[PDB]
Amino acid sequence: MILDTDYITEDGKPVIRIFKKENGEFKIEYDRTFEPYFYALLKDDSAIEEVKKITAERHGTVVTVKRVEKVQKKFLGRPVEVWKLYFTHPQDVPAIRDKIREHPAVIDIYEYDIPFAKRYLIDKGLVPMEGDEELKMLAFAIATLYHEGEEFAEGPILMISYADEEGARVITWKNVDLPYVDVVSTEREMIKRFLRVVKEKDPDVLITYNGDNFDFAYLKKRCEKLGINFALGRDGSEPKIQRMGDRFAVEVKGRIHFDLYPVIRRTINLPTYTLEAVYEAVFGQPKEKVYAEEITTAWETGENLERVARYSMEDAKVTYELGKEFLPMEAQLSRLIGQSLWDVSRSSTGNLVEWFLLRKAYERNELAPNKPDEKELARRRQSYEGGYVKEPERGLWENIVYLDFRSLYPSIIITHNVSPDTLNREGCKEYDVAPQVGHRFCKDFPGFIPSLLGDLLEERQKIKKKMKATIDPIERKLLDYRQRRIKILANSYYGYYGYARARWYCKECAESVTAWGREYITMTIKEIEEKYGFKVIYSDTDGFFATIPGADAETVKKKAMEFLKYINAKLPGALELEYEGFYKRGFFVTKKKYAVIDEEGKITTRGLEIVRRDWSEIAKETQARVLEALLKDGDVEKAVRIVKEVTEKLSKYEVPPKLVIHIQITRDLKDYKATGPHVAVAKRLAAGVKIRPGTVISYIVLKGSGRIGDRAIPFDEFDPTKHKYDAEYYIENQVLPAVERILRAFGYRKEDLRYQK
DNA sequence: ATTCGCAGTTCGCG
DNA sequence: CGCGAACTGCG
Numbered sequence: 204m205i206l207d208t209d210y211i212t213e214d215g216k217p218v219i220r221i222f223k224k225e226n227g228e229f230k231i232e233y234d235r236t237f238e239p240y241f242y243a244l245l246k247d248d249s250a251i252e253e254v255k256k257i258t259a260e261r262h263g264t265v266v267t268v269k270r271v272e273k274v275q276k277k278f279l280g281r282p283v284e285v286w287k288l289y290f291t292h293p294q295d296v297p298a299i300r301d302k303i304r305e306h307p308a309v310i311d312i313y314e315y316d317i318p319f320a321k322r323y324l325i326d327k328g329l330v331p332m333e334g335d336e337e338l339k340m341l342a343f344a345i346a347t348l349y350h351e352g353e354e355f356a357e358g359p360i361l362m363i364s365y366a367d368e369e370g371a372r373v374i375t376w377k378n379v380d381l382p383y384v385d386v387v388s389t390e391r392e393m394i395k396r397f398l399r400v401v402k403e404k405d406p407d408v409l410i411t412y413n414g415d416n417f418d419f420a421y422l423k424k425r426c427e428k429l430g431i432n433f434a435l436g437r438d439g440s441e442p443k444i445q446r447m448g449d450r451f452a453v454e455v456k457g458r459i460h461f462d463l464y465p466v467i468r469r470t471i472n473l474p475t476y477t478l479e480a481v482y483e484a485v486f487g488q489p490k491e492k493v494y495a496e497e498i499t500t501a502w503e504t505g506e507n508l509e510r511v512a513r514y515s516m517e518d519a520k521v522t523y524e525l526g527k528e529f530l531p532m533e534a535q536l537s538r539l540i541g542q543s544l545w546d547v548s549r550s551s552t553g554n555l556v557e558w559f560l561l562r563k564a565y566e567r568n569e570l571a572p573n574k575p576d577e578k579e580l581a582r583r584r585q586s587y588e589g590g591y592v593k594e595p596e597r598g599l600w601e602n603i604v605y606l607d608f609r610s611l612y613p614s615i616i617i618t619h620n621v622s623p624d625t626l627n628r629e630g631c632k633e634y635d636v637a638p639q640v641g642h643r644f645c646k647d648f649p650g651f652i653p654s655l656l657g658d659l660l661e662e663r664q665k666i667k668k669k670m671k672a673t674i675d676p677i678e679r680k681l682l683d684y685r686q687r688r689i690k691i692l693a694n695s696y697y698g699y700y701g702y703a704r705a706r707w708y709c710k711e712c713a714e715s716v717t718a719w720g721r722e723y724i725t726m727t728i729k730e731i732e733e734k735y736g737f738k739v740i741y742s743d744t745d746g747f748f749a750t751i752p753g754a755d756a757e758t759v760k761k762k763a764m765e766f767l768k769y770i771n772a773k774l775p776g777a778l779e780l781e782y783e784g785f786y787k788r789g790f791f792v793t794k795k796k797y798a799v800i801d802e803e804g805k806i807t808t809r810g811l812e813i814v815r816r817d818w819s820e821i822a823k824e825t826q827a828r829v830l831e832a833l834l835k836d837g838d839v840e841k842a843v844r845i846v847k848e849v850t851e852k853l854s855k856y857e858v859p860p861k862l863v864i865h866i867q868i869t870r871d872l873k874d875y876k877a878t879g880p881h882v883a884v885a886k887r888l889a890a891g892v893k894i895r896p897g898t899v900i901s902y903i904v905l906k907g908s909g910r911i912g913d914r915a916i917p918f919d920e921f922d923p924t925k926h927k928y929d930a931e932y933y934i935e936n937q938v939l940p941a942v943e944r945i946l947r948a949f950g951y952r953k954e955d956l957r958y959q960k
Numbered sequence: 961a962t963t964c965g966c967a968g969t970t971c972g973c974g
Numbered sequence: 975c976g977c978g979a980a981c982t983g984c985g
């Protein structure tokens with residue numbers, strides 16, 4: 204099982220390093236034979252010798268062209284012969300590719316911007332994480348002595364806990380008597396103790412939670428203080444850090460640093476991403492949280508250190524369980540894209556498509572295009588129209604059915620052969636003309652990209668069928684996450700057409716897939732109203748909510764199933780309309796804001812203020828309560844009593860202050876053109892932190908009139924006595940708007956609700 | 961740093 | 975105050 208790939212330089216030569224474990228043994232393979240290259244299209248084959256003389260220099264040493272080869276490639280399905288220019292070192296290309304393209308005898312060059320490590324996997328035909336090997340893995344987490352100081356790693360690490368299959372152990376240098384706690388002399392003795400354990404446990408996957416930005420960054424800066432060689436890797440190297448765009452990540456060579464934080468962010472969407480809520484949302488079991496202020500206060504006095512070692516023991520055991528459930532999900536995802544697990548688990552969806560097509564373009568012998576310069580990327584500022592959101596029928600309806608298309612946008616690409624190489628190809632015999640935009644796509648041959656999208660949806664349906672055949676609630680819950688990732692990955696190919704930095708950028712292909720679907724969802728809605736006589740309530744892009752105004756649930760289900768028989772046969776190719784779910788009652792506020800319930804006791808909310816992160820907890824709590832009462836048995840008279848019991852309770856001072864709103868800071872400190880209630884909290888207290896993009900600023904609005912921007916004052920600087928809370932504003936700006944937008948369909952102009960006296 | 965459609969707060973500002 | 979620009983997060 205190829206774990207990862209790498210390359211180093213020995214005396215000006217490249218040495219590919221293949222990290223793999225096979226038959227239960229770790230092994231490194233070195234390949235000094237592989238050679239970098241990039242293709243060049245020439246006007247004539249007589250001017251190749253005058254091109255074989257181009258010379259540059261990287262660091263004061265001459266750059267030449269090693270070997271030259273003549274191959275036949277296919278540019279967007281068009282045959283072409285380009286010259287393959289081999290070089291001695293991968294870094295020779297960026298020093299000479301710009302001098303070669305400026306040559307008057309060349310037309311253009313391709314495949315000059317690609318990592319030499321990923322090039323070895325694209326060529327040769329190697330897929331990481333491919334095999335039946337059982338990977339030995341352990342998770343670890345650390346506890347720090349954190350005062351409210353300034354420097355990052357000024358406080359020492361107190362206890363490094365780790366957990367594998369044998370259990371969770373803690374290593375501290377303080378007097379703690381527990382079965383799983385290892386006591387050492389000083390902080391230096393436990394860091395070298397952790398190295399002794401990592402080398403002894405022999406793991407291939409190092410699991411951490413936010414270890415990219417904290418743990419490895421903390422242990423490193425702490426070893427700078429103690430002068431310790433943090434040789435974690437199989438190669439014997441210290442954990443290397445690579446900056447990804449803005450943030451950074453840490454890799455351990457010879458192993459796989461599995462940071463669960465970037466993976467779980469995309470896998471499941473939750474209000475908070477603390478390890479307590481993640482373990483609760485995945486395993487249904489509560490986990491306690493002790494804070495650094497509680498840890499520091501407990502370590503200074505030397506008392507209550509049993510909980511700190513108990514909490515740290517939980518962090519290692521919880522991280523290992525999570526890292527064990529999500530590893531097969533990222534292992535297969537690494538097999539699809541064909542790159543290292545460390546890259547795939549933390550890279551964007553746009554790069555996963557980039558790595559996948561480059562591997563396929565080498566199989567199809569397709570010469571991949573290039574990324575745009577400033578000129579071409581400026582042309583791609585064009586926008587297109589896509590998505591038909593129907594104005595919903597405001598009010599409460601019953602016995603509603605949600606019939607949504609199954610992978611609408613990818614199926615349109617597969618069925619209509621939507622591809623840049625099929626777009627307006629003059630000469631073919633069969634065309635598929637797109638609505639409104641008028642683009643036509645050749646169908647004589649399977650175009651590049653639709654042929655790849657077919658097998659991706661087959662890998663998702665296999666996971667969908669495993670869910671039905673699985674009785675384990677947690678094991679089937681992970682499969683729901685896997686089939687959901689393939690859905691997001693498939694639609695990324697459609698958005699990849701609209702991506703300005705995409706190699707296979709085709710706005711026409713993107714605008715056509717949006718032209719379709721808009722035609723399909725409007726066609727499908729009219730077939731339900733004119734025939735069968737459904738009352739379509741609201742549609743977004745893939746489906747709609749339809750019902751019969753008076754028929755019971757039995758008639759609506761049967762008639763909807765017959766409608767599925769009378770649409771799928773009419774829809775061509777991969778286009779299919781499926782029965783996703785029936786619902787007892789459902790409220791539709793406005794566009795993309797609605798609530799719905801199953802026949803079984805549960806509530807599903809989409810777009811409403813409950814899911815919004817930047818709202819007061821009382822606004823989400825009350826809105827969920829008035830929704831829970833409405834969908835259970837109507838009883839709006841009882842729901843109105845709920846909207847008044849909190850406003851009257853808001854007259855007196857609130858419960859221990861919820862009413863915390865959360866808005867992170869985008870842009871950069873002062874790059875704003877307008878300051879709201881937050882940002883003003885960032886403008887103040889800035890002389891503070893770096894105020895880097897992505898910092899949540901939670902404030903509390905108090906005092907009285909005017910601002911807003913001048914009435915907050917966050918949460919860390921709050922006092923219920925000297926700083927009189929408002930107990931208002933939230934009755935007009937938080938709670939009441941998120942509620943009136945619901946009850947207004949019943950005839951309440953907010954004249955009711957309050958007042959006293 | 962896949963695409964676009966979407967409701968909404970906030971408020972400087974003639 | 976009504977309207978628009980900026981800003982936030984969700985689908």
Ligand SMILES: Nc1ncnc2c1ncn2[C@@H]1OC[C@H](OP(=O)(O)OP(=O)(O)OP(=O)(O)O)[C@H]1O
Nearest residue numbers: 607608609610611612690691694698744745963
């Ligand atoms: N991030 C996205 N960007 C653009 N279009 C998207 C995105 N996610 C989805 N879409 C597209 O817009 C809607 C549609 O995603 P559905 O919620 O309707 O779910 P499925 O149909 O894919 O999969 P199912 O049958 O429910 O199992 C998808 O085509």
Ligand SMILES: [Mg+2]
Nearest residue numbers: 690745809985
């Ligand atoms: Mg969805």
